């Protein structure tokens, strides 16, 4: 089961991220996280060491922990760039974030949904859109506005994803059900949709299960601004839920077992 | 031992069955209290009897401490309607907390969010209204919004409010165990469910959930679902009701703990002295 | 979903219960298998019937792949014996595999090491055997034992052994979830239990499980107890087969998987196959 | 719920030790764990960082991970002696461990059972007993031996347990059941005893529950002898097992408050 815990205190000496479960094979390194992490600062110098559980700049399938010298978003943001390189590499799975709403401004829905190539113009993005009509608005509203205290919708698509990933039982254990706790648990969250949600099109998950279309998972948002950056958090945590469902379901010793047992169920 | 819960049943086998366990003992509970909540289950608008055995774990009308299993005479809601209805005697007696689930949409006909919240002592009227409303103005245009479609296809948004939690359950720590986390995993593990908010989310107010822990408001729950010939949702928020109070039920006995209904009520006398 | 199990029921209320979840569709089993499973809980030297429904996850003698709760008519032993007897039918229709139940020693006495260990097929003649053993020189001196002493006072070592266990269930880690650590916690959750053995531990050959893991040798768990007139000890070790027999079960499933029987047995030919 | 998580490779930069759910107020040092690093060497230079959890000496109720500098047995040995902390501070609950056999030869039954006062004695003889007579015998039996091969039988002991720690619920989750499982799970462990055991003066655990008693483990063990080291590394998954189900029986959020409540249960 992929296990993961988080340490660290706002102005100590280090944070330490450690994850478990992962199979041997994945294409990991300190350059990567330190990546993801300046991402997290991004909206209108990290150091980091792989500790355990690589070698050649692979994974082992011991645990893998993580020390980032430095409330704290770091560690997780950490945990989901490995997240992101294991769903890459054993399922091509990939994952998008953007800012659907801010202070009250919607971005346009007719609009292309975002895709992983747009995601230079997304980091570029001051507010995290491709909506650039949006964007101007967005902006002319934080400065009218403290900046930080401003809500938004934030979304996370996952591309790639296989149908059959969760369970048919009602219960929490749902796909659906994980995500919509895996964000909930951010602070300053207030509300989760799977699709449409409320505007209720199913948003890649249909009666517990991933359906094989794109998952769409929409979170609301209410404590310069802190939007763009939740955005990011949240994109973490999807990644981790969809790692350790997609692991569950389809987890092998070492990434290439992986691949392969995705192939057998793909091709029956 | 965490409050825990199974189903099991298939909907047309001879019985369905329903297992809590952890509960304390001392809860006052009868397969009439069960039978009752499991009719509220059927209430809803259309346009064209339940048997009840306590296995295991109850003697004297009191739970003994020991697993409660529960055969329902007969995908169905029942079971987990069962289950909610031990977690709401429970809640009572043990903490004072009281639940009440009405429908605010349905249909995209809103209900007026102006109007005072529903409390407990709506039960009565919550059931006799077709809709579960109590907005008259707006069952009417409900009722009149199902007419002019096959019922069970529409959706809608229903609410769970939770009066008398007191502050401090759930956690800081940014995860899955904190209380609205929870919640919204309960809601969003219901069939057709595909939303949730705890206060006025989407539109905000903290829905009395603060930084992962119960602040002593009352809690708001609201879920969005989209799926004789009636509509499914005023059952969906009596489904939603009986997940949101096992929710509460287990991460109430976590934090007040006890063996018995009255130490677990000693306990939270003695937490609320400080 | 692991393998997962629940017992209720109380020494003198209608009836127990027993559920488990995470069995694969199509296990063949039968409220027969049950009865019959149950009735040897009952055998033990002495010097002074069984209702059963299948009230979920079974429809046309198979499991369904949902929750199976059983009702048994009436501490008590018979609801994990009938969930062994479930995880019999399972362990031998998926894998082929099979386990047995002896007493080594009893009061003080030992039987004899060198004679053969007892095979699935010396059922029979262990179920004849008023202390459970195949050494009819030591079982006379047991019975002088018991004679001499009250009955269920009496201690002893009982033995569970698993034919045909695939190589690589359990875990290197050294933790919690290796094989030989979670048959430990099986036995020593058994009241009366006081210590317990893989192999010829504390003597010593393996007894089937190095690093953490199955070797494909018969596993070999001992077990040391010590609490008309009879003695516990043969009926303990019935129950000890019960409780290793749903260990077994629950590490097969993970490590083998499935959602039917025939495709769990599949993912085994297939792993072996390399 | 007290949990930990260990990691490291037996030839890499580092160890990396975490636990979480202890509470705040538990006096812990780094020259404490590298002092219990130093009794696993013992048998016939440890650097230890406290990277999270800690803040003037004290837990601050946060994770606290280990980063230990070097099969390893560092990182469970460091958690048991965070354990050892805990445990005598909050409860006045203390272990003792020492070998009861080695290669066939039996120490004296009936001899007194050392006590958390003997621990310098049993650091200083080479084979970690008190019975002088059989500690030369084993010496002898080590030498007429390659020394790691050879088996044995350990015992660890805990002092000032209160009784009601467990349940009478007949399942894994009872006392003397989490207690086998622990040493169990321990490389070359074969078998475990509560008190006299096959023996068989209860050992301490009586239906499931702790009963006021001193409580003794033993553990069967057969593979410059290992068998000391492994009575150590048994009495850190015993503290950690102990800590664990004492925590939830009577845990606060920090020390003074659990204290607090094992006065109060105890006054009733
Ligand atoms: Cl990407
Ligand atoms: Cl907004
Ligand atoms: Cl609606
Ligand atoms: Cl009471
Ligand atoms: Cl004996
Ligand atoms: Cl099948
Ligand atoms: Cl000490
Ligand atoms: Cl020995």
């Known amino acids: 089961m992929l296990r993961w815990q988080t340490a660290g205190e706002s102005h100590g000496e280090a944070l330490v991220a450690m994850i478990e479960g992962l199979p041997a094979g994945v294409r990991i390194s300190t350059d990567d996280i330190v990546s993801a992490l300046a991402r997290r600062r991004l909206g209108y110098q990290d150091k980091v060491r792989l500790l355990?559980?690589?070698?050649?700049?692979?994974?082992?399938?011991?645990?893998?922990?993580?020390?980032?010298?430095?409330?704290?978003?770091?560690?997780?943001?950490?945990?989901?760039?490995?997240?992101?390189?294991?769903?890459?590499?054993?399922?091509?799975?990939?994952?998008?974030?953007?800012?659907?709403?801010?202070?009250?401004?919607?971005?346009?829905?007719?609009?292309?949904?975002?895709?992983?190539?747009?995601?230079?113009?997304?980091?570029?993005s001051p507010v995290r859109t491709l909506d650039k009509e949006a964007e101007v608005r967005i902006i002319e509203r934080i400065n009218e506005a403290a900046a930080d205290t401003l809500g938004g919708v934030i979304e996370v698509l996952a591309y790639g994803v296989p149908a059959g990933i969760g369970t048919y039982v009602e219960s929490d254990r749902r796909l659906d059900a994980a995500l919509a706790s895996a964000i909930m648990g951010i602070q300053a969250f207030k509300g989760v949709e799977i699709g449409d949600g409320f505007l209720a099109r199913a948003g890649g998950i249909e009666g517990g299960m991933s359906n094989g279309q794109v998952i769409r998972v929409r979170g609301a948002m209410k404590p310069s601004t802190a939007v763009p950056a939740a955005s990011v958090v949240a994109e973490a945590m999807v990644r981790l839920t969809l790692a350790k469902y997609a692991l569950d379901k389809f987890g092998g010793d070492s990434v290439a077992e992986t691949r392969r047992n995705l192939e057998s169920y793909l091709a029956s």
């Open 52 to 124: 355990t559980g690589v070698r050649h700049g692979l994974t082992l399938g011991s645990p893998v922990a993580i020390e980032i010298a430095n409330r704290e978003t770091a560690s997780r943001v950490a945990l989901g760039e490995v997240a992101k390189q294991f769903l890459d590499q054993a399922f091509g799975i990939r994952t998008v974030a953007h800012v659907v709403a801010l202070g009250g401004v919607q971005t346009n829905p007719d609009l292309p949904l975002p895709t992983p190539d747009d995601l230079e113009a997304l980091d570029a």
